Symmetry: D2
C-alpha cells in the first residue's frame, strides 16, 4: 500500500540508490522505525510494507537527499527531505509518495488511489 | 520513446482524461501537429509515437489544463500548460514528460533514460 | 500590474539576467509582442507594462530558461518556460508570475491581487 | 537573517496566517524550540530571530500546512512541511525559506545570500 518514487531535476533522471526511511508515530509521540530501503534504477522503492502492517496513523518518510547529492559531487542545502502524513482507511488504499529533488529545493506530492 | 504523465496536486490523484497535444517545430518555425491523446486512469499517455517518427527537433507538449479544472468545477488560472524541449539523439532514448497540476501553478520535469 | 520573479533551485539564489518576453494574442489569433525585459540581481523584473496598456487579453509570458542555463555553461532540457493566461477579464488585477528553475525541471505559480 | 514566505497554489495568493515553528538541534540531539511566528497578509514571516541568536547549527523550519488548510475548511494530505538544513557554517548568511502549497503537494526552495 506504500510506494516511494524519487526523481532528479538536475540530471533529468530517476534518483537511484537513495536511502529512504519510514517511521510511524508512537503513542508517546516518538518516531518508531517502520520500513526502509534504497530506490531502484527506476527511482522507486517497492515492498516497504503490507496491508496488514500499514494501519492508520501518522507516518514520516525521510529521504536521504544529502548523501544522494554528495555522491554526485554536488553540495546540497537540506539535511534530508521529510514527508509527514496521516494514513486514513476512509480514503483510497494505495499511497505513492513522489519527490522531485534539486540541490536547494524539492517538491513532493501524494498519489492516493484504489 | 515519448510518454506523458499528469498528476493532480489538489486531489492527490492522477489527472485522468486530460487532452494532450504534441507538436513538432517546422522549418518555417510554425508548430505542426505531431501526436495527441487523452491521459488514462493512471494519468499516463502512452503510444504517442514511434522511434522511427520521433526524430531530433524541437517539440511542444500542450496539456489542456483549463478543461481539466473546469470539468472538476474549479476555476483555473492558465489557458494550458506547455512544455517545449529539444529531442537529442546523443542523450538517452526514452522521454517522460511529467506534470503536476494546481489551479494557479504547475510543475514539470523530464525523466530521460535508456 | 505585471511582475516576473525567477529563482534558481541549483544555486539557491535569484535567477539573474533571465530574458522574459511577453506576448498578447491578437484579433487574428497570432501572438503579438507586448513587452520584454530581463530579471535584475534580485531575480525580479519590474516595469514591463502600465495599467493603461495592460488591457484584457490572453497573455503569454516566455521565460528564456535555455538562454539562462547556457549562459551559465549548462545544457538544459527545456527551450523556455511559457505561462499562458487570461488577464484582467474581471477588471484590472496585479499579477506576479513566479518561476523556480532547475536544468531538467521548472515550476511556476501566479499571485493575483486586486488593487 | 531568516525569513519564511508561503504561497497558495489553489488561490493564487499569499498563504496568510500560516504558523511556522523553527527548531535547532541541541547538543543531545533533540530538537529545541528556537523561534515561531505566523505569516502576514503578504505571506511573509519576518522577525523570527537576530544575527546574534542565529548561530551555526542544524535548523528545522516546520510550516504548519495542515492547520492552514483545515482553517480554510479543506482536508489536506500532509501534517506539515519540514525544511531541515545546516545554517551559518561558513559564517553568517541570510536565508529565505519559500514554500508553495496545494492540498496534496508542496514545494520548497531556499534563497541563501551573503550580506
Ligand atoms: C513533486 C513532483 C513529482 C513528479 C512525479 O514524481 N511524477 C511521476 C510520478 C510517478 Br508514480 C511516475 O511513475 C513518474 Br514517471 C513521474 C513530477 C513533478 C513535476 C513534481 O513536481
Ligand atoms: C517553492 C516555490 C517558491 C516560489 C516563491 O516563493 N517565489 C517567491 C519568493 C519570494 Br522571497 C517572493 O517575494 C516572491 Br513574490 C515569490 C515559487 C515557486 C514557483 C515555487 O515552486
Amino acid at each position: 500500500p506504500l510506494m516511494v518514487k524519487v526523481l532528479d531535476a538536475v540530471r533529468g533522471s530517476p534518483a537511484i540508490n537513495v536511502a529512504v526511511h519510514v517511521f510511524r508515530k508512537a503513542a508517546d509521540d516518538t518516531w518508531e522505525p517502520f520500513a526502509s530501503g534504497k530506490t531502484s534504477e527506476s527511482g522507486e522503492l517497492h515492498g516497504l510494507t503490507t496491508e496488514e502492517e500499514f494501519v492508520e496513523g501518522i507516518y514520516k518518510v525521510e529521504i536521504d537527499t544529502k548523501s544522494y547529492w554528495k555522491a554526485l559531487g554536488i553540495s546540497p542545502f537540506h539535511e534530508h527531505a521529510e514527508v509527514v502524513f496521516t494514513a486514513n482507511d476512509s480514503g483510497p488504499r494505495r499511497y505513492t509518495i513522489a519527490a522531485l529533488l534539486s540541490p536547494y529545493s524539492y517538491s513532493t506530492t501524494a498519489v492516493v488511489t484504489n
